[PDB]
From Swiss-Prot, chain A:
Entire protein: shown range: 505 to 554 of 1407
Organism: Escherichia coli O157:H7
Subunit and interaction comment: The RNAP catalytic core consists of 2 alpha, 1 beta, 1 beta' and 1 omega subunit. When a sigma factor is associated with the core the holoenzyme is formed, which can initiate transcription.
Family of this protein: Belongs to the RNA polymerase beta' chain family.
Name the UniProt record assigns to this protein: DNA-directed RNA polymerase subunit beta'
Role according to the record: DNA-dependent RNA polymerase catalyzes the transcription of DNA into RNA using the four ribonucleoside triphosphates as substrates.
Gene it is expressed from: rpoC
UniProtKB/Swiss-Prot annotation, chain D:
GO CC terms: DNA-directed RNA polymerase complex
Gene encoding the protein: rpoZ
Keyword Nucleotidyltransferase: yes
Protein name listed in UniProt: DNA-directed RNA polymerase subunit omega
Catalysis performed (reactions): RNA(n) + a ribonucleoside 5'-triphosphate = RNA(n+1) + diphosphate
Species per Swiss-Prot/TrEMBL record: Escherichia coli O157:H7
Entry keyword set: DNA-directed RNA polymerase, Nucleotidyltransferase, Transcription, Transferase
PANTHER family found in the cross-reference section: DNA-DIRECTED RNA POLYMERASE SUBUNIT OMEGA
Keyword match Transferase: yes
Family according to the record: Belongs to the RNA polymerase subunit omega family.
HAMAP family listed in its UniProt record: RNApol_bact_RpoZ (MF_00366)
Curated annotation (Swiss-Prot), chain E:
GO molecular function, a single term: DNA-directed RNA polymerase activity
Family as reported in the entry's similarity comment: Belongs to the RNA polymerase alpha chain family.
Notes concerning its domains: The N-terminal domain is essential for RNAP assembly and basal transcription, whereas the C-terminal domain is involved in interaction with transcriptional regulators and with upstream promoter elements.
Protein name (database record): DNA-directed RNA polymerase subunit alpha
Keywords for the protein's UniProt record, in alphabetical order: DNA-directed RNA polymerase, Nucleotidyltransferase, Transcription, Transferase
EC number: 2.7.7.6
Curated annotation (Swiss-Prot), chain F:
Protein name: DNA-directed RNA polymerase subunit beta
Subunit structure: The RNAP catalytic core consists of 2 alpha, 1 beta, 1 beta' and 1 omega subunit. When a sigma factor is associated with the core the holoenzyme is formed, which can initiate transcription.
Family indicated by similarity: Belongs to the RNA polymerase beta chain family.
The species this protein was found in: Escherichia coli O157:H7
Function: DNA-dependent RNA polymerase catalyzes the transcription of DNA into RNA using the four ribonucleoside triphosphates as substrates.
Sequence positions bearing N6-acetyllysine: 7
Length: 50, 50, 51, 79, 217, 50, 249, 228
């Protein structure tokens, strides 16, 4: 189950709801997913502190 | 089964490791020590990663 | 997870694995992720390829 | 709820001498012969010993010194 | 029949932009009742206030170039969305930026209006190179209750939600003999407009102001 | 034959529907095969094994 | 009944004696949870004494696997019944079909790893409607037999016991029928003789202080196995020839 | 900041019913309906049977000469007996009925504080000409599920062995669903209306359901409230 959930998240199709945009980082990306405004498989490029 | 003895058992379990073993013991990992977590019922809970 | 182990040490790797498990199970559950009779896609070319 | 003893091993990294020393110390605290050297946050003697090992304030050498002191202590009470 | 009422069993906060609260004991399922409700509230309906629309005076295109800024346009655009605005008693205040100095451009090189507070002064809105780069854009801010994207609304995504991230987890609850009860644990981060504690109280108050049309005693 | 038996019973053709989470409330994306089945309670009760 | 079967159920529910089929055709003369009197048809009876088909169902017998076997009627009073029709259903029999399991509304989907490997995740509604509450029947008997120090006694006069336990026994120490009990409770009070103990002096001091004399008898006491709690539904007594019977006997 | 109120209350069937609330903000439907249906499907007043006794029936595993039903099968239906008590707390009924014919659920003596919601229910089918029964149902209020396996611990000392226990289930609710649609209103552009379709049992009226549900829901906010 674990690998399946992770693989499901780390996927992308091409036309997910709101793909291609930009966000501050993980906080905002989750704010997008949980709210139901954005998808989970969008090709969105954002900022992340590594 | 007086009420006080349940809290007494929780006091004796506290950091008292136990050993779990799977019926065919091929390698050494067949016996591993875990930290008890008191639970209701009769089934033994096991961690999926193991 | 392996790179995590030999980069940060034992202590970090442990909590990393636990977190991975929790998150996995949650998402794999809410993704639907089922199977039905229609999922199996019988190639419409089968009939020919057989005969 | 002591989960990993990695740092506890780091002080004496042998993985077995750790158990022997921590058992000696855990005895000292359990089979009444001594008092804890770390604030006992309800932790069992088994874990408190490992914590004393972690802080670096307890090991084979230190306990060997303390017992050697008490050896002469037991002889200074018979005139 | 009576019921079981919770009492804050502990509270902890690493900083002011993030905090964790735990409410136990609870009732079966209730740990998800309150969690889900308060979570939706502090995600999609909460006052705050923030940037909505912005335009540059150098060029009018979210993909064009600029002479003097080593950064890209949509970059500063996103930084605008990352701006903690707290207007006291006004609805919408369109403030302007006026800076041409050699070096980064913080959030202090703006025009302080009547009532516009910035809880992130050192915030970096742009990086400026050498010679002059005379740049003075005109940013627009608005109110709102929740999060509204920029496409469904240069375009900027308005983030009114005073919180940046919500989370809750249910776990066991040892109550003297009670078999399996819940223990709610919320972990919430804000953006600066308000501290966590009061914001949790505010959302939970919105709940009561929604259900106030029913009670007995 | 099953596909038609479904249409007769005011049921979908794919045998799959949407499922709503009891706790969260949102629907699990990606259709879910539901229905009935014959379950067997084997004579392996834990109350006799433990 | 199986919502999805193969028809082959009747082929097994009637073969196994667990059912009860009708021999001669007639009309039910008397239904009951004990017996079923079937008034045989005039055209399907023997030309002498005329008889009737008086059936006697079994009630709650212990199977070889400690489970429960029992037959229950399926027809009401005065109803036409031909030959080959199930006059009564038994264990795992639904009006003639093989009722092996139950109908469960399944839905293939992960759930927070609660099913992770092959584990099953069941609703609370199921365990509420008692649709899987299988009944079991254990058979635990007591044996009073002659010993080296005289024959054992089945009296309710057990030493080192409490008054709350002996309250569920009769004048012969045999658990009352129907009385519900749990593990550790006494069902047959028996004591085995045991002399020549010679306790330690520390105990003799107690026997002198509080005057607590020691019984010359041990304890046998068929007591319910720990872990299971049930209800008494049958009590039998077999006494050896010659030896006069007790009261409960 | 609109505050919703009930608008539509039409109970189609004795058990099946519906309720509705329009004044909701952006997607407040889900947040309300789910968190409400939970409190409904779990906590609700209800009443049910707890103690049952019959003439010479000592245990559920027996048969009475005359009844075509088994004692187990009798209590199995006693769990499906819907009732409603207000004044008293625990009430002991009295059922006497003889002669051939199915025993209606109204064959019981009427007390001052009682009301049946479905007397058409079946308790036991009598088949003997002179078959007579005497029982005294013991009904009371509670909440949630309470099985008789854990019931016998509060200890109460039931002296008569002829007292049998029945699995309790205090659950007025049976099933609940919620839906959200886009409905125009007086002063607003676009909103959502929330419809709650429920399945009662006849014991509790659909009004007190939502009322006490929201009451108990608010009670859990006492961590951050005083008096609004």
């Amino acid at each position: 189950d674990v690998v399946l959930g992770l693989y499901y998240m780390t996927r992308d199709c091409v036309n997910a709801k709101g793909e291609g945009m930009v966000l501050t980082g993980p906080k905002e990306a989750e704010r997008l997913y949980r709210s139901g405004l954005a998808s989970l498989h969008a090709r969105v490029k954002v900022r992340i502190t590594e | 089964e007086e009420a006080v003895v349940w809290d007494i058992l929780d006091e004796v379990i506290r950091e008292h490791p136990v050993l779990l073993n799977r019926a065919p013991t091929l390698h050494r990992l067949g016996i591993q020590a875990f930290e008890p977590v008191l639970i209701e019922g009769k089934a033994i809970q096991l961690h999926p990663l193991v | 997870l392996n790179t995590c182990y030999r980069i940060l040490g034992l202590k970090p790797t442990v909590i990393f694995a636990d977190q991975i498990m929790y998150t996995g199970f949650a998402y794999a559950a809410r993704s639907g992720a089922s199977v039905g009779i229609d999922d199996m896609v019988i190639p419409e070319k089968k009939h020919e390829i057989i005969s | 709820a002591r989960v990993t003893v990695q740092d506890a091993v780091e002080k004496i990294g042998n993985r077995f001498d750790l158990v022997l020393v921590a058992a000696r110390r855990a005895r000292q605290m359990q089979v009444g012969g001594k008092d804890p050297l770390v604030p006992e946050e309800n932790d069992k003697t088994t874990v408190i010993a490992l914590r004393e090992i972690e802080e670096g304030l307890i090991n084979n050498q230190i306990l060997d010194v303390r017992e050697r002191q008490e050896q002469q202590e037991q002889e200074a009470a018979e005139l | 029949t009576e019921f079981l009422k919770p009492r804050l069993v502990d509270i902890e906060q690493v900083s002011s932009t993030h905090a964790k609260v735990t409410l136990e004991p609870l009732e079966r399922g209730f740990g998800h009742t309150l969690g889900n409700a308060l979570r939706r509230i502090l995600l999609s309906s909460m006052p705050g206030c923030a940037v909505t629309e912005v335009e540059i005076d150098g060029v009018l295109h979210e993909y064009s170039t600029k002479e003097g800024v080593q950064e890209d346009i949509l970059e500063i655009l996103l930084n605008l969305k990352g701006l903690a605005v707290r207007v006291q008693g006004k609805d919408e205040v369109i403030l302007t930026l006026n800076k041409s100095g050699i070096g980064p451009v913080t959030a202090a090189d703006i025009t302080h209006d009547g009532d516009v507070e910035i809880v992130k002064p050192q915030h970096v809105i742009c990086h400026l190179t050498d010679e002059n780069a005379s740049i003075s854009m005109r940013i627009k801010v608005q109110r709102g209750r929740g999060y509204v994207p920029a496409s469904t609304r240069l375009l900027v995504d308005a983030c009114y939600s005073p919180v940046e991230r919500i989370a809750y987890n249910v776990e066991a609850a040892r109550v003297e003999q009670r078999t399996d009860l819940d223990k709610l644990v919320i972990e919430m981060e804000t953006n600066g407009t308000i501290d966590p504690e009061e914001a949790i109280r505010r959302a939970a108050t919105i709940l009561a102001e929604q259900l106030e049309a029913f009670v007995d005693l | 034959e099953i596909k038609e038996l479904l249409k007769l019973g005011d049921l979908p053709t794919s045998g799959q529907i949407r499922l709503y989470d009891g706790r969260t409330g949102e629907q699990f994306e990606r259709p879910v095969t539901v229905g009935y089945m014959y379950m067997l309670k084997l004579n392996h009760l834990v109350d006799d094994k433990m | 009944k199986p919502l999805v079967g193969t028809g082959m159920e009747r082929a097994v529910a009637v073969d196994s004696g667990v059912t009860a089929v009708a021999k001669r055709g007639g009309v039910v003369q008397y239904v009951d949870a004990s017996r079923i009197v079937i008034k045989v048809n005039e055209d399907e009876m023997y030309p002498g004494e005329a008889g009737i088909d008086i059936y006697n169902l079994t009630k709650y017998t212990r199977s070889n696997q400690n489970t429960c076997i029992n037959q229950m009627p399926c027809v009401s009073l005065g109803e036409p019944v031909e030959r080959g029709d199930v006059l009564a259903d038994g264990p795992s029999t639904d009006l003639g079909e093989l009722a092996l399991g139950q109908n469960m509304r399944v839905a293939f989907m992960p759930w927070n790893g609660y099913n992770f490997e092959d584990s099953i995740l069941v609703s609370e509604r199921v365990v509420q409607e008692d649709r899987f509450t299988t009944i079991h029947i254990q058979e635990l008997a007591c044996v009073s037999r002659d010993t080296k120090l005289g024959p054992e006694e089945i009296t309710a006069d057990i030493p080192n016991v409490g008054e709350a336990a002996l309250s569920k026994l009769d004048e012969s120490g045999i658990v009352y029928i129907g009385a519900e009990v749990t593990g550790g409770d006494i069902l047959v009070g028996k004591v085995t003789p045991k002399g020549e103990t010679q306790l330690t002096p520390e105990e003799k001091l107690l026997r002198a202080i509080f005057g607590e004399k020691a019984s010359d008898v041990k304890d046998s006491s068929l007591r319910v196995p720990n872990g299971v709690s049930g209800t008494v539904i049958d009590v039998q007594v077999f006494t050896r020839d010659g030896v006069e019977k007790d009261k409960r006997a």
